[PDB]
Scaffold this active site. Structure first.
Site, mmCIF file in Angstrom:
data_model
loop_
_atom_site.group_PDB
_atom_site.id
_atom_site.type_symbol
_atom_site.label_atom_id
_atom_site.label_comp_id
_atom_site.label_asym_id
_atom_site.label_seq_id
_atom_site.Cartn_x
_atom_site.Cartn_y
_atom_site.Cartn_z
ATOM 1 N N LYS C 164 46.053 57.709 38.294
ATOM 2 C CA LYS C 164 47.078 57.126 37.424
ATOM 3 C C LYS C 164 46.663 55.751 36.921
ATOM 4 O O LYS C 164 45.920 55.091 37.631
ATOM 5 C CB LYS C 164 48.445 57.052 38.132
ATOM 6 C CG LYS C 164 48.998 58.404 38.623
ATOM 7 C CD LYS C 164 49.437 59.390 37.505
ATOM 8 C CE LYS C 164 49.837 60.683 38.156
ATOM 9 N NZ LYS C 164 50.483 61.631 37.225
ATOM 10 N N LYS C 190 41.777 64.155 41.252
ATOM 11 C CA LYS C 190 41.777 64.972 40.051
ATOM 12 C C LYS C 190 42.063 64.223 38.806
ATOM 13 O O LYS C 190 42.779 63.225 38.833
ATOM 14 C CB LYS C 190 42.762 66.129 40.187
ATOM 15 C CG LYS C 190 44.226 65.763 40.260
ATOM 16 C CD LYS C 190 45.078 67.027 40.312
ATOM 17 C CE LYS C 190 45.110 67.768 38.984
ATOM 18 N NZ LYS C 190 45.904 67.043 37.956
ATOM 19 N N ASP C 192 44.063 63.889 35.319
ATOM 20 C CA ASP C 192 45.388 64.385 34.934
ATOM 21 C C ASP C 192 45.184 65.548 33.949
ATOM 22 O O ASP C 192 44.093 65.688 33.414
ATOM 23 C CB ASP C 192 46.282 63.290 34.316
ATOM 24 C CG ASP C 192 47.700 63.250 34.909
ATOM 25 O OD1 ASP C 192 48.303 64.331 35.108
ATOM 26 O OD2 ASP C 192 48.175 62.147 35.226
ATOM 27 N N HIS C 283 46.080 74.054 36.117
ATOM 28 C CA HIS C 283 47.275 73.351 35.697
ATOM 29 C C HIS C 283 48.138 74.277 34.821
ATOM 30 O O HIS C 283 47.635 74.977 33.948
ATOM 31 C CB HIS C 283 46.887 72.139 34.903
ATOM 32 C CG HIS C 283 47.071 70.886 35.656
ATOM 33 N ND1 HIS C 283 48.326 70.436 36.004
ATOM 34 C CD2 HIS C 283 46.148 69.982 36.049
ATOM 35 C CE1 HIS C 283 48.127 69.292 36.630
ATOM 36 N NE2 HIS C 283 46.832 68.967 36.665
HETATM 37 O O1 LIG Z 1 50.933 64.446 36.590
HETATM 38 C C1 LIG Z 1 51.574 65.127 37.697
HETATM 39 C C2 LIG Z 1 52.425 64.371 38.632
HETATM 40 O O2 LIG Z 1 51.771 63.252 39.310
HETATM 41 P P1 LIG Z 1 52.503 62.465 40.542
HETATM 42 O O3 LIG Z 1 51.851 63.055 41.754
HETATM 43 O O4 LIG Z 1 52.216 61.005 40.302
HETATM 44 O O5 LIG Z 1 53.963 62.817 40.489
HETATM 45 C C3 LIG Z 1 51.363 66.582 37.865
HETATM 46 O O6 LIG Z 1 50.351 67.064 36.945
HETATM 47 C C4 LIG Z 1 52.637 67.344 37.818
HETATM 48 O O7 LIG Z 1 52.944 67.602 39.202
HETATM 49 C C5 LIG Z 1 52.589 68.631 37.088
HETATM 50 O O8 LIG Z 1 53.854 69.393 37.295
HETATM 51 P P2 LIG Z 1 53.821 70.856 37.969
HETATM 52 O O9 LIG Z 1 52.935 70.715 39.216
HETATM 53 O O10 LIG Z 1 55.249 71.190 38.243
HETATM 54 O O11 LIG Z 1 53.172 71.742 36.942
#
Ligand SMILES: O=C(COP(=O)(O)O)[C@H](O)[C@H](O)COP(=O)(O)O
Ligand SMILES: CC1=CC(=O)CC(C)(C)[C@@]1(O)/C=C/C(C)=C\C(=O)O
Ligand SMILES: O=C(COP(=O)(O)O)[C@H](O)[C@H](O)COP(=O)(O)O
Ligand SMILES: O=C(COP(=O)(O)O)[C@H](O)[C@H](O)COP(=O)(O)O
Lengths: 458, 123, 458, 123, 114, 114, 229
Positions: C164, C190, C192, C283
């Site tokens: 992040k 990972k 994003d 994802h």
């Molecule tokens: O960017 C993040 C959250 O980061 P953090 O860990 O900072 O909250 C993930 O890609 C989401 O979980 C995707 O949503 P889902 O897994 O429901 O598809």
């Protein structure tokens, strides 16, 4: 200073004094928050999670410049109902996006925000694609002008037909149905969207029999003919094998289902078609899973813009009058977005933003789905000449077979064209124009008697 | 149930799983070599007593298979004691060497016998 | 005898006495018809359009055997609450589908039917994939057992972290954040979902710096480490360029956004990963656009089964407790559909059909999104060991930085594992297990103080 | 604000971030293993206690994952104390070994549990 | 042939002019022994059992254990190609790890017929 | 040509490399002297069940087969008849090799005579 | 518990109460055992050696699930007469086979069992290929319908002819014989199975002359012609 812990999204992500830049991607989201969630917070949460933010403060934000990179909710527009629904306008800097990648644009904007517990519903209504971003895309392999020039077809909508039943026909019967349709006056025939390569008919067999049919019908009529051969496949390797063989046959057009195939595969095909002179027809199979409901999903106009960026020469755009959902004004709105260079903001047509295409080629819209001869005047009036009108059931359902079915559709279309060119009102004199043409066309008269009274009104 | 040690069990090919060879058992191996009509030869190594892969790693490439030849293959030797005389001579010149006795078959052009005859104390 | 004209769909497409075959693909559709549309006709229209039928009788049906090829609505199950809602069970013959193509399966089943004027709403709730069809797919490049064997990781969930801010970091800063996370006890870091290749950070630069970080952190800790390098791209050529470089670096894992990238590109990548020993993380970016609403779209369980067929070693499966929507029982149901060989029909968990996977490898589910240390016992109890628990904000938001953030998550996880193994109830003794761990772990204590009272309940 | 040391913090996977396991905590891990229907096995290593990449560097290839098997997996064992009896036996034979206790699930054919049970003094 | 009850080809004299058109073995006896540095005894091998059903990791574990005990070779069963219980690439990589670990331990060249 | 050995024709291989024959299928430690005598040095002797079926596991299984082979090699080289002194050579090796002794007790005696 | 040593094959491999699954490959073997070998043991030996078993107990069996993977003799059907002959029905789980590989299927089923000392003779009479396994194969490149549609030939058997003598003809004489056969009404001509590429006639020369013959005969008759190359 870095301070660990949760803060409101509205502190960094709600900027009502923000002046949008011409390089920003702008998004119009129809937001339905959970009760007790203020619009400024729901809007800012949308802007944050679709750009740079997370649920807690991260120290790493200080290594970069959030001012430069953050998505911003710059405008909240309360909408009628209650609900407590609103339109949240979000601006995303150009630097957030991978050049020439629709996949990347969708991943950020619509990737996670639709699943927010703090929202009941979310729908992306429109996207302003900045012209600096438009320039990173190839867009259609050919576009409207080039396609007409290649096919030598001017002054009327193009005529197509989907081979029916959707599935179950052998390669030889497919080519037979193709030849019969094309020889009767249709410019194109096409594989249905789900015709790929199956036990009842393997692709390579279909491709060669359809090439025989195209060349026989073209020699017979003296007009250029095409049959959209489906390249949609399970893998990119298989999709490219299909396009390569269509290229070897010297055939003009190929087809792809951009949503079920996907943007990554679509962009590869669009590039292959540009490099090899193939026209690319696009099916929007699965769109209504995403775009049907007013309160949640993505409006088709966003999916239409995405297709024009990724690339397609034709795209299915609805019929308005046929068996599938599509309102007149909204349709005219996205048809301009598909075809024109500049489309001014127009809320009566669902155009939230002015869209500049900086000379990216236009896409030919395709009207298909439960249409027949009596719909011809309405179709010609709504779409105009730069369109493809497609009749599957309306050709293969003719009592005399495919060639008479194709003559009926071609006569009905040409009758509307001559009538319009002579100063007649297609919107008012519709039935009369078709009735008149029935007197010198036994093929059209036979189609008119079968389909009189068949309508789609809900 | 006994566990085979994964350390202190480095091997030297043929006969190295048997108890160490006595001077008489060694002589008998040389006698078999000569009775079979093979040519005895001694080879020795001081630095790398085991195979390794430093210079290349393609199939069938290994470093450390070649050792240094002690003089020449003993063409014409009919007496096993002459081979053991040469062994004692290498052992004396290089007490810290690994030493092998090999036997060549000129018809098939292959080594038909190979056995460790000396090792340093620690390896 | 061929008779032109419109006939009701129920005449051919509604077969309530039909006995489903083990080779049929079965679909459970939640249908909301327009007023005046009988359920038998709405159900039959769904079966017809998604298989062989069109709006009017076509003579070509007689050249083939509709009995052999048609989709059939074989059962209508009236539904509680919603009017006049019902579950229409549709059977599709194996011959309709292209082998090894999720794209083709979706094109037919979900291609056009959702846009029907005759319906108000349509939701695809489940699909019974016949085991004869399952056998035509490679499925996961490795699967649960192989992945654990390759990484030498057993007896606990795997731990991950998303870097992040989502966007805005340089390649060098990315690698620095990666090394700090991995050295503290996380198995994985990972990119994003939206980090692909952008002006702020080009992919190749990121891949090289992240490889340096993986190897430094692995040497330091003595445990195998990975960073999911995003192969998601605008085209398949760029996608494969990215996977080829990851392969050259000798790194263990790569990632893809299967829905935004698309099935065709995903299946291509899954094949490449199998041929080159790369683990593939998936994802589900954009899933909530399709799967959020109860009345329209496609439930995630269908998208989860599609990913298992196309291929992935991990898939995001929700958190239940985190910032994004997901109910417990439904989650446990699709987690079994992702991991197990055989899953019996269970309506309390939303499993409409018994699913046999005929030894296709299992997918590791990933819990990610607004989770932190206090969620550890609940996460371990819901998912068990065969899972990946991901903490973006929950690592990079720690007051002492990434390595202490990673220690806090690793200590919290291991404390839950030891407690469970000792006979303690994670569902009841959760908070106590964590408070006990805080006494000897200063890193965990610091995380606990920051995130006390942070919950997601709507 | 405390800094996590970049030295002297080598790890051994599952449970290695917790304080060292007591004989009671180790017994409870073995009891869980047996209660789950898994087959216990002991593995040990003397030379390379951590993963490395000497022979190949392709994705998913690592050296040092395989350790040496101590006897055989204990099929039929129902008593946790018998596993700890084997641990004491391996510790006595190889005091300088890294030792793991593993548990196999024959249906899924995967190790369902693994934890370090002994290490040398210095590493 | 209807005119026959039975027929058995017992032997073939392959003319040396025909033999010369073939490569024959990639290496042959001498070259193999020279490559493996193994002389003066038969070579020792072992087929991994059960024939089918083992995972790639368990295969490599059985391989390392056999090779470290004095066998020159281990081998996949003839049946072992690439199956749902064990895909080939996974087996090849774990068996390579086993070969190199056992070779380093014993100091003798090892192989596993893949 | 040798009809007593089923060789109907004289075969000339004009220096085409020779193939190493592999003895495999239901063999164990007690078969070692007979195998060494029939095949000689230019052979591969394979023990699947005869290694993975050892009571102490694979590495002791491999040691048993390696000790039995090397005991036959040393015995032959010393002038002993493998065809007559077979069982005695093996029993002698059992006295110093616990791995071989454990294998001998399990397969003493398993035969295949039809 | 692992117990080293030899046990009867029938203990694990003879399962007369086994219910075959639709995913199993089933084999009908005509077994002729040696005198003194019971059919249940000969059948179980066939099932074991063609699947997961060996001559002695291996500890590794416990790392996996033999119930899931083993081949099983589930039925014995004696043959009239007395040589001890019987049909042993063997079931092999789908997981044992490599998808799309006939080579792998034959390697397991017919690989070693035919050479068993405990048998006098063995014949594989039939195989039930499960439809789940059938789906992993391409099968014919075209098949009956496609072939007829490509050649535009309907309503009768197709007519062929093998060029004779089997060996000895030159490429030009081959093409001459081909053209003469095809022009007279045969749909096809073919090379003998023996004709590949030889000193009397190299393949590329044959292929070119046969193509000349195909096109001349097709132009002459007005019917599509082929020569199997
Ligand atoms: O960017 C993040 C959250 O980061 P953090 O860990 O900072 O909250 C993930 O890609 C989401 O979980 C995707 O949503 P889902 O897994 O429901 O598809
Ligand atoms: C959802 C559904 C579909 C049917 O075809 C029958 C029935 C209504 C009983 C059912 O509830 C049962 C489904 C099951 C368990 C298996 C199957 O079908 O393979
Ligand atoms: O197969 C058809 C209908 O054929 P027919 O001409 O027989 O009705 C098309 O897929 C529809 O046009 C739906 O697509 P869209 O809504 O995207 O145009
Ligand atoms: O798997 C084995 C036997 O293993 P084991 O050592 O456990 O008996 C081999 O396939 C046989 O040798 C049969 O082949 P052949 O007779 O052709 O050598």
């Amino acid at each position: 200073g870095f301070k660990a812990g949760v803060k409101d999204y509205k502190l960094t992500y709600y900027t009502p004094d923000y002046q949008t830049k011409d390089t920003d991607i702008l998004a119009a989201f129809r937001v339905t928050p959970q009760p007790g969630v203020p619009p400024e917070e729901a809007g800012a949460a949308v802007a944050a999670e679709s750009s740079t933010g997370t649920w807690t403060t991260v120290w790493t934000d200080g290594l970069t410049s959030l001012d430069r990179y953050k998505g911003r909710c710059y405008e909240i527009e309360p909408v009628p109902g209650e609900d407590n629904q609103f339109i949240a306008y979000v601006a995303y800097p150009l630097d957030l996006f991978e050049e020439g990648s629709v996949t990347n644009m969708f991943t950020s904007i619509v990737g996670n925000v639709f699943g927010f517990k703090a929202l009941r519903a979310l729908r992306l209504e429109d996207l302003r694609i900045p012209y600096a971003y438009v320039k990173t895309f190839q867009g259609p392999p050919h576009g409207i002008q080039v396609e007409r020039d290649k096919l030598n077809k001017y002054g009327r909508p193009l005529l197509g037909c989907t081979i029916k039943p959707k599935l179950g026909l052998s390669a030889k019967n497919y080519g037979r149905a193709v030849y019969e349709c094309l020889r009767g006056g249709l410019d194109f025939t096409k594989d249905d969207e789900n015709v790929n390569s199956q036990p009842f008919m393997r692709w390579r067999d279909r491709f060669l029999f359809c090439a025989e049919a195209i060349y026989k019908s073209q020699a017979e009529t003296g007009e250029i003919k095409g049959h959209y051969l489906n390249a949609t496949a399970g893998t990119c390797e298989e999709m490219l094998k299909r396009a390569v063989f269509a290229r070897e046959l010297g055939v003009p057009i190929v087809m792809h289902d951009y949503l079920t195939g996907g943007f990554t595969a679509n962009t590869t095909l669009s590039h292959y078609c540009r490099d090899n002179g193939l026209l690319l027809h696009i099916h929007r199979a699965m769109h209504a899973v995403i775009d049907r409901q007013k309160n949640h999903g993505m409006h088709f106009r966003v999916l239409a813009k995405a297709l024009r960026l990724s690339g397609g020469d034709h795209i299915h755009a609805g019929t308005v009058v046929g068996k599938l959902e599509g309102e007149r004004e909204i349709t005219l709105g996205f048809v301009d977005l598909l075809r024109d260079d500049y489309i001014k903001k127009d809320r009566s047509r669902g155009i939230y933003f002015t869209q500049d295409w900086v000379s990216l080629p236009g896409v030919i819209p395709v009207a298909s789905g439960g249409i027949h001869v009596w719909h011809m005047p309405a179709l010609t009036e709504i779409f105009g000449d730069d369109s493809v009108l497609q009749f599957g059931g309306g050709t293969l359902g003719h009592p005399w077979g495919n060639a008479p079915g194709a003559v009926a559709n071609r006569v009905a279309l040409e009758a509307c064209v001559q009538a319009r060119n002579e100063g007649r009102d297609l919107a008012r004199e519709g039935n009369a124009i078709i009735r008149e043409a029935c007197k010198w066309s036994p093929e059209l008269a036979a189609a008119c008697e079968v389909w009189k009274e068949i309508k789609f009104e809900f | 149930m006994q566990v085979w040690p994964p350390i202190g069990k480095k091997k030297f090919e043929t006969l190295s799983y048997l108890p160490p060879l006595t001077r008489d058992q060694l002589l008998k191996e040389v006698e078999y070599l000569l009775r079979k009509g093979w040519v005895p030869c001694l080879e020795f190594e001081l630095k790398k007593g085991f195979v390794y892969r430093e210079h290349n790693k393609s199939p069938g490439y290994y470093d450390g298979r070649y050792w240094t030849m002690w003089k020449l293959p003993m063409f014409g030797t009919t007496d096993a004691s002459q081979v053991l005389k040469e062994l004692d001579e290498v052992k004396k010149a290089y007490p810290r060497a690994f030493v092998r006795i090999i036997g060549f078959d000129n018809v098939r052009q292959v080594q038909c016998i190979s056995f460790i005859a000396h090792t340093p104390a620690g390896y």
